[PDB]
């Protein structure tokens, strides 16, 4: 169709902006995860002894570990915000609608990019200098022990789709421009940008994955999977905040979490 060339231009623009916004790309995470790097190997946290061992690079241990994730999530919100501002039309949206889209979208993007840092054995932590084993995460007291298992299963399935950074840039842009987020004031312009991003994604996958049958449909289904993951994420902070009252929360996270209560 007449828009196909412009859809490749938009695809390239989002890929360039993604490289600009996200230091730790899938390509870098896979290189680290397969020792195809001249970086130093990452430290491996697999037990209580090895976590203390690696203390220098991060109450009750399970809480300290999950509280520790706040620094990475604050950096990720900043990166995602920079990326969102590069999406054509985004900065012209109602500023309150831009806040809403970031508030309801960031965790879905964090779990998406986390899949890039995961294999069936464990997850890259501390900007890629640490590897924390699935097994070690499985061993934390309930409910923490059960929490990451379904995240690892999502990742293995997501990673089996063999998406690259070019694919992911457009996928993430589609998720940001979700017109069904609670409290959006003007949904039409958001769905108009999303519709064009979906056309750009559909064409990206057809050209970049020509033998990957229904890859577009499978990717839309992953966006559904990511919303369930975020519901479970929020349900855990909710459960622990019933017993642990004095818990620290970075102001920026306080804003993202407000009203999900």
């Amino acid at each position: 169709n007449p828009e196909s060339a412009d859809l490749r231009a938009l695809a390239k623009h989002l890929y360039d902006s993604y490289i600009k916004s996200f230091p730790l790309t899938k390509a870098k995470a896979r290189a680290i995860l397969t020792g195809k790097t001249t970086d130093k190997s990452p430290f491996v946290i697999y037990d209580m002894n090895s976590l203390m061992m690696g203390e220098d690079k991060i109450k009750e241990v399970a809480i300290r570990i999950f509280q520790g994730c706040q620094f990475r999530s604050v950096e990720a919100v900043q990166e995602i915000t920079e990326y969102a501002k590069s999406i054509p039309g985004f900065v012209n949206l109602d500023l309150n609608d831009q806040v809403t889209l970031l508030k309801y979208g960031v965790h879905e993007i964090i779990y998406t990019m986390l899949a890039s840092l995961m294999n069936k054995d464990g997850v890259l932590i501390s900007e890629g200098q640490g590897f924390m084993t699935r097994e070690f995460l499985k061993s934390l007291r309930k409910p923490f022990g059960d929490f990451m298992e379904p995240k690892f299963e999502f990742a293995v399935k997501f990673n089996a789709l063999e998406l690259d950074d070019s694919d992911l840039a457009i996928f993430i842009a589609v998720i940001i421009l979700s017109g069904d987020r609670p409290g959006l004031l003007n949904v039409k312009p958001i769905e108009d940008i999303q519709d064009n991003l979906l056309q750009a994604l559909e064409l990206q996958l057809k050209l970049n994955h020509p033998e990957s049958s229904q890859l577009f449909a499978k990717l839309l289904q992953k966006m559904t999977d990511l919303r369930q993951i975020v519901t479970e994420h929020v349900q855990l902070l909710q459960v622990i905040k019933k017993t642990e009252t004095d818990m620290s929360l970075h102001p920026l996270l306080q804003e993202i979490y407000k009203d999900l209560y």
Binding site: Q78, T81, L95, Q98, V99, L252
Partner: peptide, 10 residues
């Protein structure tokens, strides 16, 4: 006082 707004406007 929105921290997301401050990030959005920078």
């Amino acid at each position: 006082p929105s921290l997301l707004k401050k990030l959005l406007l920078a």
